[PDB]
Amino acid sequence: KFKLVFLGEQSVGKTSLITRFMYDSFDFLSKTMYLEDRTIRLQLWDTAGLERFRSLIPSYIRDSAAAVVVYDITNVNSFQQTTKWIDDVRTERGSDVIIMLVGNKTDLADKRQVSIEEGERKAKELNVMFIETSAKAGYNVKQLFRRVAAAL
Ligand SMILES: Nc1nc2c(ncn2[C@@H]2O[C@H](COP(=O)(O)OP(=O)(O)O)[C@@H](O)[C@H]2O)c(=O)[nH]1
Ligand SMILES: [Mg+2]
Questions:
Q1: Torsion over CA: 14, 27, 33, 31 (sign)
Q2: What GO biological process term is on the record, naming one?
Q3: On the CB side of 61, how many CA atoms lie within 13 Å of its CA?
């Protein structure tokens, strides 16, 4: 079993990605996944409010094996804040944690402010994994979780 925490500014789609993956709908939780030689259980921790209650970050993310740090591709501030979220994960967890940086809302194509290239560069700069998703369209949501699960 592996504790996976979702992190990111308000309104980026942290809950929506979990919903889409767990229930396949769009408006902790346990999910078992089957890998070639392994079978593992992900515990998906989601919360609102963390950007307001910063001092709770260390304890909320305490024993995480993975952190999925989400921004909204139409919202530059949400992308800029992901360095801060990732620094919170490293401070608490060191290198004992898989991190996936996620640019969500790819279906809002005409409102995009962060190109896929800038997301990829930030991920490479910080040595984390990267993907883009649409929770609404269901694009790359299963890919996100299968890559994280394979890396654990
Ligand atoms: N167009 C679009 N809207 C989304 C997507 N994901 C989430 N949203 C919307 O963005 C808002 C915030 O999503 P939510 O899951 O609540 O974000 P959270 O605050 O990060 O949990 C809601 O109105 C969602 O319907 C997406 O992939 N595409
Ligand atoms: Mg939420």
A1: positive
A2: retrograde transport, endosome to Golgi
A3: 30
| Residue whose structure tokens are 């883009």 | 132
Atom 12 in ligand 1: residue holding the nearest Cα: 11
Q: Which residues of 11-24 are buried (b: 16+ CB within 10 A; e: fewer)?
A: ebbbbbbbbbbeee
Q: Which residues, at least 6 apart from 108, have a Cβ–Cβ distance to it below 8 Å?
A: 73, 74
Report resolution (Å) to 1 decimal: 1.9
How many angstroms separate the alpha carbon of residue 15 from the centre of ligand 2? Answer: 4
Domains parsed from the chain with CATH numbers? 1-152 (3.40.50.300)
- Break sites following residues in the chain (C–N > 2.5 A): 27
Ligand number nearest CA of 27 is: 1
CB 14 within 8 A of CB 7: yes
Collapsing DSSP to helix, strand or coil, 151 comes out as helix
For ligand 1, atom 28, which residue shows the shortest CA distance? 105
Instruction: Kindly identify the ligand whose nearest atom is closest to the C-alpha of 10.
Output: 1
Report the first-to-last Cα separation within the chain, whole angstroms.
10
DSSP strands (E only) in 35-143: 39-45, 66-72, 98-104, 129-132
